[PDB]
């Protein structure tokens, strides 16, 4: 995880970095091997958390592509 | 000296499925052969970036294209357990398809030109069987 | 500025940390000879991309009053001016005017020799491409006076004229023309302006052998009247601003290579 972009409930929760469902996070995508049209390597993208991490013990997210 | 390629020369569409094999003609870079998953091979004129021929007859993905060393034949091997030979100057199949492989034909290798005998060429096809 | 285009023009004219390349306005007085106009045309042809041209006759004597010059500079956003004039006392005169904040910073008169003057069209050579800045050579002992004088101001003015657009990189194919100004310390000394095209030949080493061929124009100048800057205005104009990409060095703090 690179950062926390937007927690939908509260900007204070965004500032505190809370990982709940629907939160937009920034992820390091160096492992996925994404090259832009100009040949540059994209290594940071946005993903949305799709689960309830406080209940699950883990963070599940889906890339916003 | 060969100079490094630095930019796009041409982008030619026409294949309806992913391109699985490609090979230049041994005579020059003017002729290119590609073989795709739309059960066709295609000859391209690379001077103008245009299609030249479409080779049809396979009922599976054309896994391999291979020019003859003298450049007078093109062999295609496909997922339909067959190998076909084509005349690259007319786009027509030479004689009939080659039958006898039970599973997918994966690779082709022409006999070298200086080893040809009995007035014919020989072609090795390696298959999944 | 209700219009977005006028807002863009105002922002272009606004003071900046990294300044725009200077624009030169070429204008003439009520009496201006054909030799002076040809000299002005040659200078404009050398500086086409960042110049504007006036075509009317202006009743301006710059060393008496420069209110119209300040008005023209404010209207056209031109900080360099070339003023052409002619007289019985001064037969062919080019007045270089450099301004600061739409007010006259300094002024210098050049007296052109008519007999030795040759235009660019009088040389049968391949000319400089439009917008290409040339290299520069200043030669002689007249440009190292310990006290600022007319030749020092002439060197500064000619640098501001042939400066062009600054760039951190240059193509090696863009070094084909050189501008040479020669002047010696001493009845008046002659400031000579020449332009040459550059040819390179193999010499058996890594460095090439340079050869020059005359490009034009051919100009002989005598320095005349001078208007020196106010010291406070000079300090304001010679102040240098730091870009945001120039880090202010902190004690014991640095950046590693990663």
């Amino acid at each position: 995880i690179l950062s926390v972009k937007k927690n939908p409930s509260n900007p204070l929760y965004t500032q505190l970095g809370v990982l709940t469902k629907g939160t937009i996070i920034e992820v390091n995508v160096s492992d996925l091997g994404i090259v832009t049209a100009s040949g540059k390597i994209a290594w940071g993208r946005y993903a949305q958390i799709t689960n309830n991490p406080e209940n699950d013990g883990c963070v599940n997210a889906v890339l916003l592509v | 000296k060969v100079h490094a390629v630095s930019r796009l020369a041409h982008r030619i569409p026409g294949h309806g499925q992913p391109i699985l094999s490609c090979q230049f003609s041994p005579v020059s870079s003017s002729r290119l052969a590609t073989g795709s998953g739309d059960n066709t091979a295609r000859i391209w004129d690379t001077d103008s970036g245009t299609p030249k021929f479409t080779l049809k007859g396979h009922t599976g993905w054309v896994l391999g294209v291979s020019w003859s060393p003298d450049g007078k034949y093109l062999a295609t091997c496909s997922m339909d357990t067959t190998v076909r030979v084509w005349d690259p100057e007319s786009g027509k199949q030479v004689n009939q398809e080659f039958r006898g492989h039970a599973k997918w034909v994966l690779a082709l290798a022409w006999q070298p030109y200086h080893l040809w005998r009995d007035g014919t060429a020989r072609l090795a096809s390696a298959s999944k069987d | 500025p209700r219009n977005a285009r006028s807002k863009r023009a105002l922002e272009k004219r606004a003071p900046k940390i990294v300044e725009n390349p200077k624009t030169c306005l070429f204008l003439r007085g009520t009496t201006c000879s054909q030799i002076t106009q040809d000299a002005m045309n040659d200078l404009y042809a050398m500086r086409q991309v960042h110049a504007k041209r006036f075509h009317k006759k202006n009743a301006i004597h710059p060393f008496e009053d420069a209110t119209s010059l300040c008005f023209f500079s404010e209207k056209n956003d031109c900080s360099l001016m070339v003023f052409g004039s002619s007289n019985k006392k001064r037969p062919h005169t080019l007045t270089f005017v450099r301004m600061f904040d739409y007010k006259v910073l300094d002024m210098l008169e050049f007296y052109l020799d008519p007999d030795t003057y040759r235009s660019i069209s009088q040389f049968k050579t391949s000319k400089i491409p439009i917008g290409m800045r040339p290299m520069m050579v200043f030669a002689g002992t007249a440009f190292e006076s310990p006290v600022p004088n007319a030749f020092t101001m002439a060197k500064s003015m000619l640098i501001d004229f042939f400066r062009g657009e600054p760039s951190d990189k240059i193509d090696v194919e863009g070094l084909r023309f050189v501008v040479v100004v020669t002047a010696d310390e001493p009845q008046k000394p002659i400031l000579r302006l020449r332009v040459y095209g550059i040819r390179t030949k193999r010499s058996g080493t890594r460095l090439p052998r340079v050869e020059v061929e005359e490009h034009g124009p051919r100009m002989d100048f005598r320095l005349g009247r001078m208007r020196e800057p106010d010291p406070a205005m000079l300090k304001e104009a010679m102040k240098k601003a730091k870009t945001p990409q120039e880090e202010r060095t902190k004690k014991n703090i640095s950046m590693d290579l990663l």
Binding site: - | - | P15, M135, V137, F138, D171, V172, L175, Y196, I198, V210
Partner: protein, 188 residues
């Protein structure tokens, strides 16, 4: 032919401006022959161009890119006057001085966005501007009207222009404050 010139005093350079300074005197011959004068001047130009080319090809970083062969140039060191004074911070407005005194922080760019979620419609809408939330109900088919407000309402006016009236009053007050700040800053 040599590629190095030898002079009693070495050249100085400013490679940001592609400038070579020659301290040595130009011994122009005291002749009336334009031709000998011209190959003397051309020889001086030849030495200057040669030493400039040598300095540029030996003391700068050379990089071969798709654009061409480029020389990394230093920033210019010859002192030249500016055309306009160095920009200075603007005088503080009344709001700016008040906010500095009271410790009021600037709002974040996410905080000041012209977007909000209307839950009644379940839609994203602009707070101000075209079809903004500050003009809500001015195009609705039905508006409830208070009897006292419609009794106190002047003749000719409608309830459909009240929000535009309030917006015009707010804009007028803000514009008056801005003009006062501009006049004070111009006085300073």
């Amino acid at each position: 032919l040599p590629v190095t010139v030898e002079k009693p005093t070495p050249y100085t350079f400013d490679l940001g401006l592609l400038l070579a300074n020659d301290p040595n005197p130009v011994n122009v011959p005291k002749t009336t022959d334009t031709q000998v004068l011209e190959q003397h001047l051309a020889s001086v130009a030849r030495d200057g161009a040669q030493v400039l080319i040598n300095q540029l090809l030996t003391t700068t970083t050379i990089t071969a890119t798709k654009d061409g062969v480029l020389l990394t140039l230093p920033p210019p060191t010859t002192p030249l006057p500016r055309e306009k004074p160095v920009p200075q911070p603007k005088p503080e407005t009344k709001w700016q001085a008040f906010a500095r005194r009271r410790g009021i922080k600037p709002k974040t760019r996410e905080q000041r966005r012209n977007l909000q979620y209307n839950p009644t419609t379940g839609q994203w809408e602009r707070k101000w501007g075209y079809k903004g939330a500050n003009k809500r109900g001015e195009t609705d088919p039905i508006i409830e009207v208070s009897a006292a407000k419609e009794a106190m309402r002047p003749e000719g006016t409608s309830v459909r222009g009240d929000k535009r009236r309030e917006i015009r009053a707010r804009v007028k007050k803000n514009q008056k404050q801005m003009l006062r700040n501009q006049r004070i800053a111009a006085e300073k």
